[PDB]
Design an enzyme around this catalytic site. Structure first.
Site, short mmCIF file in Angstrom:
data_model
loop_
_atom_site.label_atom_id
_atom_site.label_comp_id
_atom_site.label_asym_id
_atom_site.label_seq_id
_atom_site.Cartn_x
_atom_site.Cartn_y
_atom_site.Cartn_z
N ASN B 146 0.80 -1.22 0.00
CA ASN B 146 0.00 0.00 0.00
C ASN B 146 0.84 1.28 0.00
O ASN B 146 0.32 2.33 0.36
CB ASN B 146 -0.98 0.01 1.18
CG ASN B 146 -0.29 -0.21 2.52
OD1 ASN B 146 0.88 0.12 2.71
ND2 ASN B 146 -1.04 -0.76 3.47
N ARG B 284 2.89 8.28 11.30
CA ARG B 284 2.42 7.84 12.62
C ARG B 284 1.97 9.06 13.41
O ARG B 284 2.54 10.14 13.29
CB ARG B 284 3.51 7.10 13.42
CG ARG B 284 4.09 5.89 12.72
CD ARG B 284 3.11 4.71 12.69
NE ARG B 284 2.80 4.21 14.02
CZ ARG B 284 3.62 3.46 14.75
NH1 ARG B 284 4.82 3.13 14.27
NH2 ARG B 284 3.25 3.04 15.96
N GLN B 313 -4.86 5.07 18.82
CA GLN B 313 -5.74 4.51 17.82
C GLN B 313 -6.47 3.32 18.40
O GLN B 313 -5.84 2.44 19.00
CB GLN B 313 -4.98 4.09 16.57
CG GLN B 313 -4.70 5.29 15.69
CD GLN B 313 -4.19 4.93 14.33
OE1 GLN B 313 -3.59 5.76 13.67
NE2 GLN B 313 -4.45 3.70 13.90
N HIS B 332 -7.76 5.91 10.27
CA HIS B 332 -6.61 5.22 9.72
C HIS B 332 -6.99 4.25 8.60
O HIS B 332 -7.33 3.10 8.87
CB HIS B 332 -5.87 4.48 10.83
CG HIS B 332 -4.55 3.94 10.41
ND1 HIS B 332 -3.90 2.94 11.10
CD2 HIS B 332 -3.75 4.28 9.38
CE1 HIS B 332 -2.76 2.67 10.50
NE2 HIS B 332 -2.64 3.47 9.45
N1 LIG Z 1 -1.61 3.27 6.19
C1 LIG Z 1 -0.52 4.17 6.44
O1 LIG Z 1 -0.74 5.30 6.75
C2 LIG Z 1 0.92 3.66 6.30
C3 LIG Z 1 1.21 2.68 5.39
C4 LIG Z 1 2.48 2.23 5.26
C5 LIG Z 1 3.49 2.78 6.05
N2 LIG Z 1 3.20 3.78 6.95
C6 LIG Z 1 4.06 4.51 7.97
O2 LIG Z 1 5.03 3.79 8.49
C7 LIG Z 1 6.43 4.45 7.87
C8 LIG Z 1 6.73 3.77 6.50
O3 LIG Z 1 6.78 4.61 5.36
P1 LIG Z 1 7.71 3.98 4.11
O4 LIG Z 1 8.13 5.02 3.08
O5 LIG Z 1 6.93 2.89 3.39
O6 LIG Z 1 9.03 3.25 4.83
P2 LIG Z 1 10.60 3.30 4.30
O7 LIG Z 1 10.62 3.04 2.81
O8 LIG Z 1 11.31 2.20 5.04
O9 LIG Z 1 11.09 4.79 4.83
C9 LIG Z 1 12.06 5.57 4.24
C10 LIG Z 1 13.20 5.71 5.23
O10 LIG Z 1 13.22 7.12 6.08
C11 LIG Z 1 14.18 6.69 6.85
N3 LIG Z 1 14.58 7.49 8.02
C12 LIG Z 1 14.36 6.82 9.28
C13 LIG Z 1 14.69 7.48 10.57
C14 LIG Z 1 15.27 8.86 10.56
N4 LIG Z 1 15.61 9.52 11.84
N5 LIG Z 1 15.49 9.53 9.29
C15 LIG Z 1 15.15 8.88 7.99
O11 LIG Z 1 15.36 9.47 6.99
C16 LIG Z 1 15.28 6.16 5.87
O12 LIG Z 1 16.16 7.08 5.50
C17 LIG Z 1 14.37 5.68 4.67
O13 LIG Z 1 14.40 6.61 3.52
C18 LIG Z 1 6.22 5.70 7.74
O14 LIG Z 1 6.91 6.24 6.52
C19 LIG Z 1 4.71 5.79 7.40
O15 LIG Z 1 4.56 5.80 6.09
C20 LIG Z 1 1.93 4.22 7.08
#
Ligand SMILES: NC(=O)c1ccc[n+]([C@H]2O[C@@H](COP(=O)(O)OP(=O)(O)OC[C@@H]3O[C@H](n4ccc(N)nc4=O)[C@H](O)[C@@H]3O)[C@@H](O)[C@H]2O)c1
Ligand SMILES: NC(=O)c1ccc[n+]([C@H]2O[C@@H](COP(=O)(O)OP(=O)(O)OC[C@@H]3O[C@H](n4ccc(N)nc4=O)[C@H](O)[C@@H]3O)[C@@H](O)[C@H]2O)c1
Lengths: 374, 374
Positions: B146, B284, B313, B332
């Site tokens: 998703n 989140r 939530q 959500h």
């Molecule tokens: N239904 C919803 O609402 C829903 C659905 C799916 C997912 N989610 C949520 O759960 C997370 C996953 O999102 P994500 O983009 O899928 O996860 P990821 O690809 O691993 O993240 C990119 C990373 O950012 C990092 N990073 C880390 C720590 C830091 N101090 N600085 C950084 O910069 C690192 O660099 C890397 O680029 C949240 O994003 C949000 O979306 C919500």
């Protein structure tokens, strides 16, 4: 000279003292190279409410300090309106399509001093052009001032209908949660087939904004696009509108209203749509048969309908599009964001300065001068 | 061979009998090449409601015809819940992040047969990973199912906040017109500065969809994007989040929640935002100090806040974000469109088939396996 300017009402709590932000994003030109309006000066701060009676399009100081008079009113309808009273000796008439002061043949006949009919915005359907031609009245408009604004509104409505935004937000606002209730009608837009019925300034800007959503783009129009443009956006061309509807998950109307397009969306043509299609109409209300659309959403032939245009306008209080299932309507607002208002108030002043100083009005602004010269 | 599966409730007027459309758009792969789920078969029609109690993720006939048992409930919270009672001997637990069955240390200790913790979606946040490591429980999720859905939800909320869609639709819905009331808080998005706090799966998909709106794009991350992507999207990199906030008109949070990011938006950091900034948060809820956000909207410092994530939530009925000025909240839901459900129900079945048959689960689905993160 006497300038007669019709604007819409101030907000319910009065003309605003403060605004959410301090300034507006800097923009040089519209897509295609036409530069933004270039008045010599402006007497407003961009971002102020300019399209209501107290905003006055920012015109009063420039006009009164140059010997002119400015009558600003919202009373525009009927023979005993303020507008028709002040019209008989007005040199210039200004109005927005969001509250248009109609220049009928009979009104133009009564307007003894009329020389310039100015549209603060886009769309001179309220002006009888043959009467302007015959009577040597210039007709101008602030071309391109809000095409991007409407394009944004369209994509926003597409996303909101497809993802069932508005009922979901109502669950949150009213204290619920109700996940299955929100998403029982919610889909992703990705890989849907999306068509626009015209593809001029708004239609093209909508197509560009949809492309990175990985939708499959379709369009119809009287005049094909340069297939250089077709190749870049991977467009499927349809020679007729009725061919495009059946293959589209989403259809947005971006076509002008005239007799051949009036009620082009009707009970008969809605049966050419895929079950659960979505229609977005920011063009004109009367492109769509009011009750055919209402029937389509109650039956599920459409899964959403959204727009800011209605018939009649302003929409009566009980108008069915206000409360029909899965509507995303707003009032007629999409081209009068504070951003757009700053551009077309500036354009209005630019045209007035040219007109009073005897300098040429921008050719892209013109609709009529001596004859149907654009 | 006992599968304990926690899902959210059916719609308040019962599990749906009909749906808005017949099928879903065809999609081959996710951005970057990963293929969509490849189970041996599915016993649902894509587009059905699968994430609620009567949807059962489409799993019952597959499990029961293989001699497994399936227990499906929405009662998951606290020690007196159906979930806690059924957990003591479940071999497999399945849960969505929209209605998560928390696998705390104490609960995993009670789960004497637990072998597989499956996230029907993305986000193992509800599972204590050290406990899973120590107890040799496999932890898996349906990676990428998703990401695009949430990205669409973000762009939808950005446009709605900037153009003041939700109050405008209320004026239409309630029988009004009130052009000036609608647009006194409406702007175009074009040429605004928009920043994402991270640029992972969702953040990159958001940036790609924003580009043709002609905004100026900004981003932060621990690891920069590839220089080729920076120049394709014309990105401005910022090394700290705090260095990004003061130049952005819009900030969208797409970062995981862990100690360095909890309450990263608070009364102090909010003073770095421009006047009239917008925030969208689909990441989140606890990334933001809940009352600091509300205070910033009440006092006119923020022009808008929107998202689908809350803390706690589900949100209590008096959670302040439900009613604070200029909010665009949903429950959500953004990752559980019917489209997304079809992908993670298919992936859930794929993972189960692999696990029961002893074939390796895909590497991209794995979070914990064999006593280690993987
Ligand atoms: N239904 C919803 O609402 C829903 C659905 C799916 C997912 N989610 C949520 O759960 C997370 C996953 O999102 P994500 O983009 O899928 O996860 P990821 O690809 O691993 O993240 C990119 C990373 O950012 C990092 N990073 C880390 C720590 C830091 N101090 N600085 C950084 O910069 C690192 O660099 C890397 O680029 C949240 O994003 C949000 O979306 C919500
Ligand atoms: N506040 C608002 O809601 C708002 C704001 C601005 C404008 N408008 C509305 O007034 C129209 C102008 O829209 P436009 O895109 O600005 O005008 P244009 O660039 O000249 O149109 C492209 C043309 O389509 C043509 N055409 C013509 C006749 C025919 N039988 N078939 C065709 O195919 C022709 O070929 C050409 O491509 C509507 O679009 C609608 O938007 C509403």
């Amino acid at each position: 000279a006497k300038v007669l300017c019709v604007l819409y009402d101030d907000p319910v709590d009065g003309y605003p003292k403060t605004y959410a932000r301090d300034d507006l994003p800097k923009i040089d030109h519209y897509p295609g190279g036409q530069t933004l309006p270039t008045p010599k000066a402006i007497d407003f701060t961009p971002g102020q409410l300019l399209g209501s009676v107290s905003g006055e399009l920012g015109l009063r100081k420039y006009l009164e300090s140059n010997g002119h008079t400015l009558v600003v009113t919202s009373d525009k309808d009927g023979p005993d309106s303020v507008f028709e009273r002040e019209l008989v000796d007005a040199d210039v008439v200004i109005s927005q399509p969001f509250w248009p002061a109609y220049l009928t043949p009979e009104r133009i006949a009564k307007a003894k001093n009329l020389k310039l009919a100015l549209t603060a915005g886009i769309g001179s359907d309220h002006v009888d052009l043959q009467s302007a031609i015959d009577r040597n009245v210039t007709v101008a408009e602030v071309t391109y001032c809000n095409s991007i604004s409407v394009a944004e509104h369209v994509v926003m409505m597409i996303l909101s209908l497809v993802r069932n935004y508005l009922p979901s937000h109502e669950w949150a606002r009213k204290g619920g949660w109700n996940i299955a209730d929100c998403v029982s009608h919610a889909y992703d837009l990705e890989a849907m087939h999306v068509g626009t019925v015209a593809a001029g300034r708004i239609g093209l800007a909508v197509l560009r904004r949809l492309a990175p959503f990985d939708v499959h783009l379709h369009y119809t129009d009287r005049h094909r696009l340069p297939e250089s443009v077709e190749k870049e956006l991977n467009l499927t061309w349809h020679a007729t509108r009725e061919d495009m509807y059946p293959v589209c998950d989403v259809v947005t109307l971006n076509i002008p209203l005239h007799p051949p397009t009036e009620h082009m969306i009707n009970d008969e043509t809605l049966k050419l749509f895929k079950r659960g299609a979505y229609i977005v109409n920011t063009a004109r209300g009367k492109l769509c048969d009011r009750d055919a659309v209402a029937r389509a959403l109650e039956s599920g032939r459409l899964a959403g309908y959204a727009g800011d245009v209605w018939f009649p306008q302003p929409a009566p209080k009980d108008h069915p599009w206000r409360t029909m299932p899965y509507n995303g309507m707003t009032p007629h607002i999409s081209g009068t964001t504070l951003t757009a208002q700053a551009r077309y108030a500036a354009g209005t002043r630019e045209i007035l300065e040219c007109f009073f100083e005897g300098r040429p009005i921008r050719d892209e602004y013109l609709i009529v001068q001596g004859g149907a010269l654009a």
